[PDB]
Ligand binder design. Structure first.
Ligand SMILES: CC(=O)[C@H](NCc1c(COP(=O)(O)O)cnc(C)c1O)C(=O)O
Ligand SMILES: CC(=O)[C@H](NCc1c(COP(=O)(O)O)cnc(C)c1O)C(=O)O
Lengths: 401, 401
């Protein structure tokens, strides 16, 4: 019979139509240009993109494209193999060495994404006798990595050092052997930088390891763009740092875990995504080696980005919008209702501003928002223009007075 | 205090030392050339690679490199965004449409790897009231995808249709709502092709969905290279098919899930790796569109691959070796002892043959082997050389008489 399978398919169709009615259906907008500030969409119109992880504006940089091409010319198109078989080229090692040095760590191991780095981290290093204490606002990739781990789990309210301490005492009282605190370096839907000084101080007091996902920090957060550990001045106090090559560092693909030598080598020996998934492509490896140099010499880019973030926040703050977070390129405009968020975004596009509405499940129901993201590429003029558009539409939709 | 953190690092060091003592430490060998049959290693010497997923020899093909370059010239280096925000270009949709048509499915959704396509599949479609029945030999990526799902789990011995039916009865009698059978199309460490005819017939009898991971079949298995569903004559009967772009289809990176339109759209709306991980890079998207045309152009590469597989299996079997599986490019030479596998691999490189030893945890302890993989790029002479080297070393080591 096909009664149950028929139901499976019918409920999917029903649930999709229901999502649409509730303003929860994500529609993909086709972009026909390369990733940059000024993009072109399907109908050929030009709009300013204010929602990319292209923080330093390098996603379409000539130098990275050139490096990628040179990489394919000398090292090929694909490895067609996981690292331990025949997927390790000299350039993979050069990149890992360069990454470890950049982050101030002993070694680094490559993955095809930070989602995988996180997924293949916890289960490999901790077990049933251990405990993991996570910030409740942690990224989905951290949560899923922790779900695959046998360690006892505990959670503390976002940036709440009082609860973190309570959970640490709880874990230790329960007899946990090794304890690890896991937190985003920057909470991506809120534009909030973690309180790593507070976290590390507690880690010392309770003998716990510290893991930080710096996907939305590496390359532009910190005076040398090293990440949240530099920004919070706890360099050397974070045991494990994971990151991505798909954000500020090029935006193509790839991720990694940087830590002490023992951790990294054990990950190479037992991390499932590393053992059972393709090695990073030569084009990405080559371009990533080049991007780290561009980042190290990107002080002017960071200055621009930082100036852009303060301009947009200051101006939107003056306009009366409710904005989450502080001191980061991610500036979420809080709207609550998903239908209003989608409408606001569509109206903004008519005004030449490209942003996306965020709603369940990427963010909680009732807490919909438009997460804007500044880039070093944006000009003061574009930002003023975006602000004037947000203000006009915000007033028309009853979002602001 | 720091007793526990100190112990954490010491134990990792102890674990590493214990691993190499038992012949379970994987050393990576640096390759300085592009991926191909005749590769170059660190010291500049040339060796023939018989352990790559480069089934059609396209990993360093000039047409793919050219397509990748053109893709970057028009679409940039990276998307620096997940698909629903600003990571969808016209080319992403084009590739998904081409993949769907190629596989004989309604639609397809791209991921950065098949590891993640599997990881983000099950949890999104099934829940606590459902059941997943898995072939015991399933790949780690399927297993980890199932581990994130709340559905009740059942396992059946590899290719055991009797036990598969037993579990289907068990699940249904237990009151399961939706039941899904999950299986590799080709089991990668053994070179065994799944019995999809038997699986699908049973799926109909018990009203169950069927999922197949065709990573080691898409592009070269089947008269038209469509995969195990074509080979087993069950095209259209497999509800969900996942695959990779990192094997026969180029070998760079990327994965996908193909299924009915409503399944695919629901995945776009709720699959975690899709919502919270970078969109596929333009270079890979472009090259992938080209590779599908290359696979379709004719049967020449597939013919050579199968002739090569036939030759190696016949010659190695006549030479006295114990081999696993049948009828596939993957031809495992069973050695049992990890120390012997490691030694055999090293001795083979001295003879100009590059293969790798496989042991715990990639395969059970006591079941070490050297998994060879034929490629359309291999020549009859290279294979004969390989067989002669294997024979010579095998006799020297006492693996064969
Ligand atoms: C290369 C191997 O040794 C082989 N590959 C992994 C694999 C995947 C993952 O593909 P991605 O690189 O993540 O796109 C998916 N399914 C299967 C069945 C396999 O084998 C392996 O694991 O042996
Ligand atoms: C692009 C977003 O909207 C943002 N990015 C994801 C993310 C990752 C995954 O990086 P990969 O693309 O897998 O290399 C890892 N950590 C964090 C903290 C985030 O946010 C997002 O999720 O909102």
């Amino acid at each position: 019979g096909s009664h149950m399978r028929g139901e499976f398919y019918q409920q999917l169709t029903n649930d999709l139509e229901t999502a649409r009615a509730e303003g929860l259906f994500k529609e993909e907008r086709i972009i026909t240009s390369a990733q940059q500030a000024d993009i072109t969409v399907a109908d050929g119109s030009h709009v300013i993109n204010f929602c990319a992880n292209n923080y330093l504006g390098l996603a379409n940089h000539p130098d990275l494209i050139a490096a990628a091409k040179a990489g394919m010319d000398s090292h090929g198109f694909g490895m067609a193999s996981v690292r331990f078989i025949c997927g390790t080229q000299d350039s993979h090692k050069e990149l890992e060495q360069k990454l470890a040095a950049f982050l101030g760590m002993e070694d680094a191991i490559l993955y095809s994404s930070c989602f995988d780095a996180n997924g293949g981290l916890f289960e490999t290093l901790l077990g049933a006798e251990d405990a993991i204490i996570s910030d409740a606002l942690n990224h989905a990739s951290i949560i899923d990595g922790v779900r695959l781990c046998k360690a006892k789990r505990y959670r503390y309210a976002n940036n709440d050092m009082q609860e973190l301490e309570a959970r640490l005492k709880e874990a230790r009282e329960a007899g946990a052997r090794h304890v690890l605190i896991a937190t985003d370096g920057v909470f991506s839907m809120d534009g909030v930088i973690a309180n790593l000084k507070g976290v590390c101080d507690l880690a010392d007091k309770y003998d716990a390891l510290v893991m930080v996902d710096d996907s939305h920090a590496v390359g532009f957060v910190g005076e040398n763009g090293r990440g949240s550990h530099e920004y919070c001045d706890v360099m050397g106090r974070v045991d494990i740092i994971t990151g991505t090559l798909g954000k500020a560092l090029g935006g193509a693909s790839g991720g990694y875990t940087a830590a002490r030598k023992e951790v990294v080598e054990w990950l190479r020996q037992r991390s499932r995504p590393y053992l059972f998934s393709n090695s990073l492509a030569p084009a990405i490896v080559a371009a990533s080696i080049k991007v780290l140099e561009m980042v190290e010499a990107g002080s002017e880019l960071r200055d621009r980005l930082w100036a852009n973030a303060r301009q947009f926040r200051e101006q939107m703050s003056a306009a009366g919008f409710t904005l989450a977070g502080a001191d980061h390129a991610i500036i979420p405009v809080m709207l609550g209702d998903a239908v209003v968020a989608q409408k606001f975004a569509r109206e903004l596009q008519k005004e030449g501003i490209y942003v996306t509405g965020f709603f369940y499940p990427v963010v909680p129901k009732g807490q919909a928002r438009i997460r804007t993201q500044m880039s070093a590429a944006h000009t003061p003029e574009q930002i003023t223009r975006a602000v004037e558009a947000f203000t006009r539409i915000g007033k028309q939709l009853g979002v602001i007075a």
